[PDB]
């Protein structure tokens, strides 16, 4: 029932939710940036975005996280992916596409800019999905080093257990960025 | 001791299964690329990988990522056993389309592999029979800067002397 649904069910077998992850990845795929491409997934966590890229036919997929426990789980989820434990400062290879899922929001740190800097020194096509609170900062930074062809609003549910009132909004705002590196 | 010697012994233990570049020459070749700074922490692609010796060697030298392809399914199966940390795949060179820091090949001389190398990688290396030296030099010099064209000898059985003249090419892509 569509590539998004077909991918989603494969992601659900693994140990961003599967629907959102599938949506995000299919966009990159339709842009022509997954299939037959070398891809690197930064801050891979359980590896869902890396496994998804592999499932979509990426020529090669590399993924890293600072947490060894996350990598241990990721490797079992999809062995075909080149998973590694590493700090972003350690990344030094070249890849067609860079994917990341930034946790930071309003407050930016040395690390937050570290991922952006590394992305532009590493890949031609850069994608990010995360909190919409970093929207202004990210757009500014991405547009200063590349062409932002995508800045899309996507809604993420906030469990009621994390809400402070019945009249509060049920779904916060996230943002998807797609950028073409000015460098290579 | 010796980085070259250590790698050589490791590569020799690799299963042949499916003139091959001997472990010594392979180690020598890869160490040159490593010292050029194009293996360690880099994304490497080994074209026509065979039993995967050059791909496994690149992995053992700390490549950040290694991809390798061959049109022979049995070679790829043996390669995967030799070093599972490498992204081995069955494929014709025409199907390759990703970008990598470094392209490594061992041509049995085909412009097909050469064209793909220049389309995909910043650094291009080749090792093979010295008789293809003129052909390859012409092909490489047009789309890149040849910084290495070295004569070396590969150890081979006498059944077919025990040495054959080979040539090593190191090229920097004009592109990228």
Automatic annotation (TrEMBL), chain A:
Cysteine disulfide partners in this protein: 51-78
Q: Which Gene3D superfamilies match?
A: Vaccinia Virus protein VP39 (3.40.50.150)
Cross-referenced Pfam families: PrmA (PF06325)
Taxonomy, top ranks, is: Archaea, Methanobacteriati, Thermoplasmatota, Thermoplasmata, Thermoplasmatales
Gene Ontology molecular-function annotations: transferase activity
Task: Quote the protein name from its UniProt record.
Answer: Methyltransferase small domain-containing protein
From TrEMBL, chain B:
Disulfide linkages recorded for this protein, renumbered to the chain, are 56-83
Q: Which Pfam families match?
A: PrmA
* GO MF annotations, alphabetized: transferase activity
Gene3D superfamilies, alphabetically?
A: Vaccinia Virus protein VP39
- PANTHER family reported in the protein's UniProt record: RRNA N6-ADENOSINE-METHYLTRANSFERASE METTL5
Protein name, entry field: Methyltransferase small domain-containing protein
């Amino acid at each position: 029932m569509g590539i998004k649904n077909d991918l989603e069910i494969r992601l659900q077998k693994l140990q961003t939710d599967a629907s959102t992850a599938a949506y995000f990845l299919i966009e990159i795929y339709n842009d022509g940036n997954i299939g037959g491409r070398s891809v690197i997934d930064a801050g891979t966590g359980n590896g869902i975005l890396a496994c998804g890229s592999y499932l979509l036919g990426a020529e090669s997929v590399t993924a890293f996280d600072i947490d060894p426990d996350a990598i241990e789980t990721a490797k079992r989820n999809c062995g075909g992916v080149n998973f590694m434990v590493a700090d972003v400062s350690e990344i030094s290879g070249k890849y067609d596409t860079w994917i990341m899922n930034p946790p930071f929001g309003s407050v930016v740190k040395h690390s937050d800019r570290a991922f952006i800097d590394k992305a532009f020194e590493t890949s031609m096509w850069i994608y990010s999905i995360g909190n919409a609170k970093a929207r202004d900062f990210l757009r500014r930074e991405f547009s200063a080093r590349g062409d932002v062809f995508r800045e899309e609003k996507v809604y993420i549910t906030v469990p009621r257990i994390y809400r402070h009132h019945s009249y509060d909004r049920a779904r916060i705002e996230a943002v998807i960025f797609g950028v073409r590196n000015h460098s290579f």
